[PDB]
Write a protein that binds this ligand. Structure first.
Ligand SMILES: *[C@@H]1O[C@H](CO)[C@@H](O[C@@H]2O[C@H](CO)[C@@H](O)[C@H](O)[C@H]2NC(C)=O)[C@H](O)[C@H]1NC(C)=O
Ligand SMILES: *[C@@H]1O[C@H](CO)[C@@H](O[C@@H]2O[C@H](CO)[C@@H](O)[C@H](O)[C@H]2NC(C)=O)[C@H](O)[C@H]1NC(C)=O
Ligand SMILES: *[C@@H]1O[C@H](CO)[C@@H](O[C@@H]2O[C@H](CO)[C@@H](O)[C@H](O)[C@H]2NC(C)=O)[C@H](O)[C@H]1NC(C)=O
Ligand SMILES: *[C@@H]1O[C@H](CO)[C@@H](O)[C@H](O)[C@H]1NC(C)=O
Lengths: 48, 68
């Protein structure tokens, strides 16, 4: 659900799309996430 | 139903603000916190890159307001 969780009913959202939202909340456009989704996902998984 | 981008004439169009959604008939762009569908035009989109890189890109049509 993402951030929708803390404001009314939780709303399902595709995970990659909530990440796009989160990227666009830090000034980086969503294009970065979709074009580099594989690298972003790999850095996430490695960090864990 | 959603898509992260629209593939139109070989280019990927991302929503400028909000999310692309399908109402069962047509694709519209609307805001995440309140459904209010807008026509997807070149004003409501951000073009970046080709159609090969985005996962889940769809073959919709983006309207051009400059057409007489
Ligand atoms: C940012 O730097 C990273 C490395 O720190 C690049 O990611 C790696 O790229 C090599 C090829 O050059 C691959 O073999 C690795 O598997 C990639 N790794 C990851 C995500 O761990 C990344 O491409 C660079 N990004 C940009 C935009 O320049
Ligand atoms: C999806 O959006 C389209 C366009 O906004 C809706 O189509 C219109 O529906 C009204 C009400 O029945 C008609 O008076 C219009 O003439 C229709 N427009 C066109 C271009 O056909 C459609 O009903 C919406 N569908 C859903 C499920 O919300
Ligand atoms: C968007 O339309 C293009 C065609 O204009 C689709 O690409 C074709 O896909 C078939 C297989 O179904 C191949 O045999 C053709 O050679 C492809 N043509 C070209 C020009 O690449 C594309 O798959 C459609 N995209 C989506 C998301 O539906
Ligand atoms: C969603 O998952 C299906 C497999 O169940 C896959 O065919 C489809 O391409 C995926 N769509 C996106 C946007 O990842």
């Amino acid at each position: 659900a993402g951030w929708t969780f803390g404001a009314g009913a939780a709303l399902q959202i595709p995970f990659a799309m909530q990440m796009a939202y989160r990227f666009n909340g830090i000034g980086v456009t969503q294009n970065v996430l979709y074009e580099n989704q594989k690298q972003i996902a790999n850095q996430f998984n490695k960090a864990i | 139903t959603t898509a992260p981008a629209i593939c139109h004439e070989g280019k990927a169009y991302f929503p400028r603000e909000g999310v692309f959604v399908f109402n069962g008939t047509s694709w519209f762009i609307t805001q995440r916190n309140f459904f209010s569908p807008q026509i997807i035009t070149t004003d409501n989109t951000f073009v970046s890159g080709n159609c090969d890189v985005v996962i889940g890109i769809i073959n919709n049509t983006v309207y051009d307001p400059l057409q007489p």
